[PDB]
Design a protein around this motif. Structure first.
Motif, mmCIF file in Angstrom:
data_model
loop_
_atom_site.group_PDB
_atom_site.id
_atom_site.type_symbol
_atom_site.label_atom_id
_atom_site.label_comp_id
_atom_site.label_asym_id
_atom_site.label_seq_id
_atom_site.Cartn_x
_atom_site.Cartn_y
_atom_site.Cartn_z
ATOM 1 N N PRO A 1 0.632 -1.307 -0.099
ATOM 2 C CA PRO A 1 -0.112 0.190 -0.277
ATOM 3 C C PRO A 1 0.893 1.240 0.007
ATOM 4 C CG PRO A 1 -0.994 -1.683 1.670
ATOM 5 C CD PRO A 1 0.554 -2.079 0.990
ATOM 6 N N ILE A 2 0.330 2.304 -0.512
ATOM 7 C CA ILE A 2 0.988 3.717 -0.647
ATOM 8 C C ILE A 2 0.691 4.620 0.487
ATOM 9 C CG2 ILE A 2 1.004 3.467 -2.897
ATOM 10 C CD1 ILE A 2 -0.983 5.324 -3.283
ATOM 11 N N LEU A 3 -0.242 4.207 1.364
ATOM 12 C CA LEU A 3 -0.608 5.047 2.652
ATOM 13 C C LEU A 3 0.629 5.107 3.570
ATOM 14 C CD1 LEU A 3 -3.663 2.650 3.970
ATOM 15 C CD2 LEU A 3 -3.555 4.902 2.400
ATOM 16 N N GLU B 1 -1.491 6.992 8.506
ATOM 17 C CA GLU B 1 -2.630 6.794 7.755
ATOM 18 C C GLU B 1 -3.152 5.417 8.175
ATOM 19 O OE1 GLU B 1 -1.932 8.052 3.873
ATOM 20 O OE2 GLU B 1 -3.096 9.863 3.917
ATOM 21 N N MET B 2 -2.435 4.591 8.654
ATOM 22 C CA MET B 2 -2.594 3.035 9.031
ATOM 23 C C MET B 2 -2.810 2.770 10.386
ATOM 24 S SD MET B 2 -0.323 1.335 5.790
ATOM 25 C CE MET B 2 1.465 1.906 6.629
ATOM 26 N N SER B 3 -3.153 1.656 10.661
ATOM 27 C CA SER B 3 -3.849 0.882 11.967
ATOM 28 C C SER B 3 -2.647 -0.050 12.311
ATOM 29 C CB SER B 3 -5.141 0.410 11.673
ATOM 30 O OG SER B 3 -5.897 1.386 11.062
ATOM 31 N N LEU C 1 -9.017 -9.717 9.385
ATOM 32 C CA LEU C 1 -8.858 -8.362 8.558
ATOM 33 C C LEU C 1 -9.060 -6.862 8.764
ATOM 34 C CD1 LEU C 1 -10.051 -10.701 5.424
ATOM 35 C CD2 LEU C 1 -7.748 -9.506 5.609
ATOM 36 N N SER C 2 -10.059 -6.994 9.874
ATOM 37 C CA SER C 2 -10.175 -5.536 10.241
ATOM 38 C C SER C 2 -9.633 -5.221 11.721
ATOM 39 C CB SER C 2 -11.744 -5.029 10.063
ATOM 40 O OG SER C 2 -11.933 -3.663 10.715
ATOM 41 N N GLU D 1 -3.594 -2.695 7.312
ATOM 42 C CA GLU D 1 -3.769 -2.348 5.830
ATOM 43 C C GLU D 1 -3.051 -2.907 5.160
ATOM 44 O OE1 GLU D 1 -3.650 0.138 8.218
ATOM 45 O OE2 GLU D 1 -5.616 1.013 8.217
ATOM 46 N N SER E 1 -4.765 -6.629 4.978
ATOM 47 C CA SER E 1 -5.727 -6.630 4.021
ATOM 48 C C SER E 1 -5.376 -6.630 2.653
ATOM 49 C CB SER E 1 -6.734 -5.870 4.501
ATOM 50 O OG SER E 1 -6.211 -4.419 4.263
ATOM 51 N N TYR F 1 -3.881 -10.133 1.821
ATOM 52 C CA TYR F 1 -5.021 -10.969 1.627
ATOM 53 C C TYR F 1 -5.717 -10.923 0.310
ATOM 54 C CZ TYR F 1 -9.382 -13.421 2.921
ATOM 55 O OH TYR F 1 -10.377 -14.139 3.167
ATOM 56 N N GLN F 2 -5.939 -9.713 -0.375
ATOM 57 C CA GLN F 2 -7.053 -9.544 -1.441
ATOM 58 C C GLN F 2 -6.141 -9.893 -2.536
ATOM 59 O OE1 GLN F 2 -9.804 -6.278 -1.347
ATOM 60 N NE2 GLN F 2 -8.379 -5.538 0.238
ATOM 61 N N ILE G 1 -12.356 -7.197 -2.844
ATOM 62 C CA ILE G 1 -12.999 -8.458 -2.964
ATOM 63 C C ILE G 1 -13.396 -8.898 -1.476
ATOM 64 C CG2 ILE G 1 -12.107 -9.132 -5.022
ATOM 65 C CD1 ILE G 1 -10.146 -10.840 -3.456
ATOM 66 N N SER H 1 -15.465 -2.750 7.657
ATOM 67 C CA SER H 1 -15.651 -2.094 8.888
ATOM 68 C C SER H 1 -16.542 -0.842 8.610
ATOM 69 C CB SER H 1 -14.287 -1.205 9.418
ATOM 70 O OG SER H 1 -13.374 -2.172 9.320
ATOM 71 N N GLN I 1 -6.339 5.239 -2.596
ATOM 72 C CA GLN I 1 -4.771 4.532 -2.979
ATOM 73 C C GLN I 1 -4.681 4.198 -4.599
ATOM 74 O OE1 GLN I 1 -2.793 1.485 -0.266
ATOM 75 N NE2 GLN I 1 -4.767 1.501 0.573
#
Lengths: 303, 306
Positions: free
Chosen positions: A6-8, A12-14, A54-55, A229, A232, A235-236, B8, B15, B239
């Motif tokens: 990710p480019i976050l 911006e991330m958790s 995932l969250s 992030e 997730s 995973y995707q 997906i 959330s 993103q």
């Protein structure tokens, strides 16, 4: 499929080990102890490990019905899943997904709705994950609450975590000590593996947050191996790993300059070339960028 | 140019974008009695954040700052700072700090504090009433009612972590009011820089909502909370920033077990979904179902009826 991260930005991330934002990046030695978190564990091609789900909003949450222990302020929760369905203790995970992966006392609110009339209630509560009654792999945990009469039986009850407490300074929580998910009745099983750099001159890179403190003098540092992030994302995408190590560059888009480079290992953690504890100094728009697959013998430029 | 996609993830893997809790279900219902103008969970499909929307669910309805007791009461004023504890700038062109609650109601949680000098900590139950004249986040302050009148120290970092909602009065489920915006500057001024209201206009269409149940903490609250976009979709569009090739993205909700399409819907480029249905309806879906982008279409595309 081309691999990407990710480019976050970091802020911006958790955190993947507690439902709080990331704050900063840290590296330090970890040869003297076991680094084996169970949340925030994912391979780069998207295989979840440990207790990872995932969250971030589900981490260290508990749901179930509760029963008072004697006529005390303690309550036993018989755990159910995120959507109130069965938890199966025979599934080959260490404990329910999202279960705390550190020894400490977590404070939050225990909330309950009475189904028949929609009445609701909430009380401060603490779960001690070092307690013999912390047995989530058996399907139950025990809370100490600020009530000895208000919670009803057979009603949906949720714990929302807020922070950590300490008694007796900064001796607890112990973020790298796993709880015994079955208490005294069995040893931990099906764990995500312990992690360590294998290359001379390298250390782990940690994604760091500060847990809120709720009482006493707690150790509030919480380090994760991957942002939620990224879990997730991998995973995707499920992008195949072309080698065991992905080379990332941390870049400042304001200047195009690379600040440092690091190795993302296929099994889901990052190393940097550095010796000693170090709080990284990063620009507000900095982000990680995948540049190439390398072998285990690649020598990083010093961080 | 970059192909557009949606995540997906299944519904339960995501959330809510308006409160830090998981999604539970898909819901469609009529909205002609409301102005639907949420400020969280607002993002265009090409990745422009709107309203008070930021990127992680864990920051939603959180407040940080220093606190001062109101008189000799159990109420405290928080002078807000940003998420990373830097000063909050009221001149930024947003309605309120990112992540500010976007509904009128009473949110209960814990107010926590650390004393930096000695590492001591404390926490108390607290409620913020977002319909209060003292709810002025755009001006830089909000007021909490707490269970203490003496324990919080001045000048120390203090955080509110939201848990759920409360209700008071004989009219059950009369609050919160999820489709009523707070006045972010209180009585001082009107709201500014809002994400626009959304409504179906096409005959036979309704909004599709991603629905959660907020925990209830006292009384008889209305615990329904609907968002327009999951938080993971906000993060994805931000993103990817894939250009919108038309006004509407046609999505199909698919069961990957069978590959069969369960329903189709229209994702408007300004960041909300409509479906062809009338009336309240909890969608019947398999737990592994997910959304798939199929083609760029226009506002007048006539969907297969739900």
């Amino acid at each position: 499929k081309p691999f990407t991260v990710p480019i976050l930005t970091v802020e911006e991330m958790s955190n993947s080990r507690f439902p709080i934002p990331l704050e900063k990046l840290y590296t330090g030695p970890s040869s003297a102890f076991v680094v084996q978190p169970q949340n925030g564990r994912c391979t780069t091609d998207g295989v979840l490990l440990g207790t990872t789900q995932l969250s971030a909003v589900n981490i260290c949450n508990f749901r179930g019905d509760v029963t008072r222990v004697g006529i005390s302020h303690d309550y036993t929760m018989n755990l159910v899943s995120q959507n109130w369905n069965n938890y199966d203790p025979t599934e080959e995970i260490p404990a329910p997904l999202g279960t705390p992966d550190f020894v400490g006392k977590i404070q939050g609110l225990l909330t309950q709705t009475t189904r028949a009339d929609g009445s609701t209630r909430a009380h401060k509560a603490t779960v001690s994950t070092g307690s013999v009654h912390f047995t989530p792999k058996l399907g139950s945990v025990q809370f100490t609450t600020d009530t000895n009469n208000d919670f009803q039986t057979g009603q949906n009850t949720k714990f929302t975590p807020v922070g950590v407490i300490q008694d007796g300074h900064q001796n607890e929580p112990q973020q790298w000590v796993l709880p015994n998910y079955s208490g005294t009745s069995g040893h931990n099983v099906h764990l995500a593996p312990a992690v360590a750099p294998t290359f001379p001159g390298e250390q782990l890179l940690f994604f760091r947050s500060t847990m809120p403190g709720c009482s006493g003098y707690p150790n509030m540092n919480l380090d994760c191996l991957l942002p939620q992030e990224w879990v997730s994302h991998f995973y995707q995408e499920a992008a195949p790993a072309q080698s065991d190590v992905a080379l990332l560059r941390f870049v400042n888009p304001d200047t195009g300059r690379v600040l440092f480079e690091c190795k993302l290992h296929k099994s889901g953690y990052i190393t940097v070339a550095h010796t000693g504890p170090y709080d990284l100094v990063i620009p507000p728009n900095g982000y990680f960028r995948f540049d190439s697959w390398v072998n285990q013998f690649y020598t990083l430029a010093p961080m």
